[PDB]
Design a protein around this ligand. Structure first.
Ligand code: XMM
Ligand code: XMM
Ligand code: XMM
Ligand code: XMM
Ligand code: CA
Ligand code: CA
Ligand code: CA
Ligand code: CA
Ligand code: MN
Ligand code: MN
Ligand code: MN
Ligand code: MN
Lengths: 237, 237, 237, 237
């Protein structure tokens, strides 16, 4: 199976698979059953921002999800990620809908990785920043239902021509280049990511959520990973 | 055919195809026959540095190639590159040997592209930096004879197990992700690249050289592009 | 006297001191009488963006000033700036009003300088980015009338409590740290700057303009530099 | 008194003021008596690298100090630094000698601060990088005995003309511009620093150490802060 580390913006509480009974953000290490979660009062119809960070010295993966003037939700988990993940990875965004639905719209996305040693210059770095998305994003690997729209937004899950969200959808976008996140000789490795998003929904209980994730380079949407599994996992183990 | 823009570090004068009669650096726009050149006193056995820059406002592609304490060679050419190149490209390094030979060793390579509009943050950016190369560089597309060695260096052309250079070799390394260098709505696009290199040779007249190049995303080594054509062009037109 | 290099966004044509007879952008090298200008259809009441760039290899100082959907104005000048300027400088924004007036409001400002040699890491770099300004910007040297307002904007010239611009005003903001733009041993030096601005005015012919400028570290507003001299020069020589 | 947060590379065990009985690295929050320490096998005569990082979400200040091929020493401490420090600070390096001595030579130093909100672009950033130091470093505030030498190195403490270290010395270097590390409206603030150093000594027990520190902007060497107090504190409380 794939090897997954993710930060989930989980709009829909699936208490039968261990979610808290409220919308939440979470840190997922090789399981949909988050190792740490925080209560997230998600604001449908408003643009949110997520900031995710990690470095191999502190060994604390953290995320903050904010809406301007309203809320800042934070979650952290202590984990040696370079122990969990392979040395080379791809990074990506995923989203799903299931029986219930929402737009999973990404307006911008940036990422930086550094692999350092014995200099003020990091032996290796990758950075990308998208403040919008082109009609043919040749530097993204689009998986499942993911597409870019005429506004320059990345629609992870299916929307109709009027922008209405559809159920039973799954989509992912990976950055095209593999990222070298560890080498046995590294002194420190770090990564940071930010994205902005817009979740709209006509449903009283929108679903299912958005993730930022890191995986083996050849990662693909698992069979049966729809809805509550966020396009990341084949099961709820 | 491919669409090529390159900066050539041309060690071997092929006067029959328009080279000056001395080792030189040059700006190549869709032809091996450089649009501008400068005399390059290349120092075999010494580590050199090349810095290349362009922005769409100034429209001047420039390169400087230096060896510490000895020489700084500069070449520039006025050209609207975003007119010449497609909107999406891959960036790369090439090298060849022919009847004569040299190591074409890359010790480090960095690149930054920016596509800007109406903000102090560039609507799009890609950056990578390699201060060494891994044994399996999953973020490089290696073409022809190019490989990485046990010292962490990128050997563009064939070297034996003792490091001796071989003739009749061609190799290229592309960064894995396509780069978005223009959009019709862009206010300014720019790129910068630096690499360090080591050319060693037992030959009295080493050959053939190293380039940094930008091309259509699906670029491949053309048939008949060995030696004097630097792995870039099918002919000397 | 100070040593000044500037990019001027000159809203008011002072034809008696060599301005073209229309609002214009210009490159100023030690004189208010621009070495190169371009016609600028300035859009009062709209947020503009200016992007300025230079590197010591190309030796071409360029600027582009844009308003989204309307206009992109470009000006360039070939000059060896590291010949004109001292090795250490301060960088800044200036603005004036005179008999006629306008707001000279800066919404954001970023700057990067690099001094490079023989590595993919630039022997020296300074970068700052302000996407807003604090009520006490301790990393700015405010000169003359310059202040920050309750919206987080930098008002270079005097505005009343309702935001109405005042005549006979001059103001500048320098970044606090000196910038090392040249060393005799440098292989390449470069700088880039971006700012966004908002010029509003009740006057039929607004004045006087905004500049980005580079100067000796101890630069100060010259006596008699108001209005048409943009807070930069003691006279119109 | 000043408000100090520091990472200490403490070469000399002062057990009478709470040091461990071995050379160590440590996290100092408003006291020389470190909140967390780690055993540091310091290699006199070898170039070391220190990497320091923090972000306001994780709230974990970490440092790693390494010598290539030999050792990597790590220390971390959970602390809300934006609670401890004022909103505006200066950042710096300090060093001392006392009865015993060592060179406190800085070969390079870089720093990045970010203050973020609701965008993939950080509402505020400052970065500097010095891969060497000029004879008149106009962007450093040199305090006490600190000077730059003819090799381009920053000698924090006094060395004779042959490079021999002197006792009873204290010196600091601050970056010239204040740094904005917090604002009440910030979603996340972070900083990172790296420096490389060379400690040489003829003494069997070299002293006293080097720090990277963050302080109120108007920070100065306290009276009585020599030797074991690392030029940071007026006493050992
Ligand atoms: O999109 C929201 C959720 O819809 C489905 O789960 C249900 C949510 N409410 C229900 C009510 C009845 C039944 Br049967 C089901 Cl499967 C569900 C499933 O698709 C879940 O995976 C998903 O998390
Ligand atoms: O590697 C150096 C050069 O070697 C070959 O050209 C010759 C250089 N000296 C010669 C001498 C004789 C003959 Br025949 C040839 Cl082809 C050459 C050809 O392979 C050239 O493309 C290449 O630039
Ligand atoms: O602010 C616009 C301009 O106003 C003044 O110049 C005049 C513009 N129109 C005029 C009409 C009459 C007289 Br007298 C003067 Cl000085 C001016 C002077 O302050 C100029 O320096 C400035 O560029
Ligand atoms: O430089 C090393 C140390 O030297 C001095 O402390 C002593 C170290 N060994 C000693 C032996 C005797 C006496 Br008295 C003293 Cl003060 C010391 C003092 O200067 C200390 O602050 C410093 O840490
Ligand atoms: Ca869920
Ligand atoms: Ca040739
Ligand atoms: Ca004018
Ligand atoms: Ca001590
Ligand atoms: Mn969940
Ligand atoms: Mn040639
Ligand atoms: Mn003018
Ligand atoms: Mn200690």
């Amino acid at each position: 199976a794939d090897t997954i580390v993710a930060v989930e913006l989980d709009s829909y509480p699936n208490t039968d698979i261990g979610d808290p009974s409220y919308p939440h953000i979470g840190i997922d290490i090789k399981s949909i059953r988050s190792k740490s979660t925080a209560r997230w009062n998600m604001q449908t119809g408003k643009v949110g921002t997520a900031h995710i960070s990690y470095n191999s010295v502190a060994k604390r993966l953290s995320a903050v999800v904010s809406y301007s003037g309203t809320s800042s939700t934070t979650v952290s988990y202590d984990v040696d990620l370079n122990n969990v993940l392979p040395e080379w990875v791809r990074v990506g965004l995923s989203a799903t809908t299931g029986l219930y639905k929402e737009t999973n719209t990404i307006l911008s996305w940036s990422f930086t990785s550094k692999l350092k040693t014995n200099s003020i210059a990091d032996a290796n770095s990758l950075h990308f920043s998208f403040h919008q998305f082109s009609q043919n994003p040749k530097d993204l690997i689009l998986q499942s239902d993911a597409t870019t729209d005429s506004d320059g937004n990345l629609q992870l899950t299916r929307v109709s021509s009027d922008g209405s969200p559809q159920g039973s959808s799954v989509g992912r976008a990976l950055f095209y280049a593999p990222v070298h996140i560890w080498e046995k000789s590294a002194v420190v490795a770090s990564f940071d990511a930010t994205f902005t998003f817009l979740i709209k929904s006509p449903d009283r209980d929108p679903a299912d959520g958005i993730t930022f994730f890191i995986a083996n380079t050849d990662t693909s949407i698992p069979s049966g990973s729809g809805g509550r599994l966020l396009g990341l996992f084949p099961d709820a183990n």
